[PDB]
Amino acid sequence: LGLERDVSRAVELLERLQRSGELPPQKLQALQRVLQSRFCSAIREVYEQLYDTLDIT
Amino acid sequence: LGLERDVSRAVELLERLQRSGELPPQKLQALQRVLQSRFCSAIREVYEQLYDTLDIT
Amino acid sequence: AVQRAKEVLEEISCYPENNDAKELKRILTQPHFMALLQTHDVVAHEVYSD
Amino acid sequence: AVQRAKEVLEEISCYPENNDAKELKRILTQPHFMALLQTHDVVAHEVYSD
């Protein structure tokens, strides 16, 4: 689902820009916590888990 | 959250009616498979895991 | 998943004799169980719709 | 979660100098990442939003 690749890429991309400090990083750091948060982790596991679930049943 | 108690109760409640066999057991069997299915299990784990996440974050 | 549950409520609703149908209509209608079901459709749809 | 993400796209979108912003906008725009985020709001909303 390219979720780990897209999220992880969005997380580092937000940090990347955060390091640059060209635009308001406050919103970028907010996202970091929105995706990095343990919550989105469980949810993310769902997407990957669900796909597998499809292959099982 | 009460999803385990409500789902598990809906599962046995669907079986319960199935035991009696008075109403269309087809749609009821469908539900049982929708709540018992491994998929809904992952999703269910999310609701529980999510609540915990709240307590963490 | 929510629609299927809903449909069941209608069937079991028409049955005022099955006590299981009663407790099932209540729980099945409980928004909470609906929320989880919502997740069921969101994913199940994006994976088996288009 | 989605709104916050979208908000960032707008900010980074206003900057045609950051190459990460471009690739970041794309990733944050695809409905896939939005779907997961959708789950974020669905639960959080049904958790304690009201």
Domain positions in chain A are 1-57
Asked if residues B17 and B28 have their Cβ atoms less than 8 Å apart, the reply is yes
User: How many angstroms separate the first and last alpha carbons of chain D?
Assistant: 16
* CA nearest neighbour of A44 among D42, D4, C41, B43: B43
* Residues in chain C closer than 8 A to A51 (CB atoms): 47
Tokens standing for D34? Answer: 């939005």
Tokens standing for A43? Answer: 């949810």
* Residues in chain D closer than 8 A to A23 (CB atoms): 11-12, 14-15, 18, 21
The CATH code belonging to domain A1-57 is 1.10.287.650
Tell the residue number behind the tokens 């919502």, with chain if given. Answer: C38
Cβ burial C3-42 (10 Å sphere, 16+ → b, else e):
ebbeebbebbeebeebebbebbbebbebebbbbbbbbbeb
Instruction: Give residue D2's identity as a one-letter amino acid code.
Output: V
Q: DSSP alpha helices (H): ranges in D1-50?
A: 2-13, 19-29, 31-48
Q: Is the CB of D33 less than 8 angstroms away from the CB of A7?
A: yes
Q: Is the CB of C46 less than 8 angstroms away from the CB of D39?
A: no
Instruction: Confirm or reject contact between D47 and chain B (CB < 8 A).
Output: yes
Query: In chain C, where are the structural domains located?
Result: 1-50
Virtual torsion, Cα D38, D44, D46, D49, nearest 10 deg:
-120
Tell the residue number behind the tokens 């909303």, with chain if given. Answer: D45
Please name the CATH architecture into which domain D1-50 falls.
Answer: Orthogonal Bundle (1.10)
* CA nearest neighbour of D2 among D16, D30, B56: D30
**How many Cα atoms sit within 13 Å of B41 on the Cβ side?**
11
* Residues in chain D closer than 8 A to B49 (CB atoms): none
Cβ-based neighbours of D8, under 8 Å, separated by 6 or more:
A14, A27, A28, A30, A31, D24, D28
Size of interface A-B (CB pairs under 8 A): 33
Cβ within 8 Å of D, A 15-44: 16-17, 20, 22-24, 27-28, 30-31, 34, 39-40, 43-44
Q: What is the largest CA-CA distance in chain C?
A: 41
Asked if residues D40 and A34 have their Cβ atoms less than 8 Å apart, the reply is yes
User: What distance in Å separates the CA atoms of residue C7 and residue C9, rounded to the nearest whole number?
Assistant: 5
Tokens standing for A20? Answer: 């640059």
Q: Which residue among B37, B38, B53 places its CB closest to the CB of A38?
A: B53
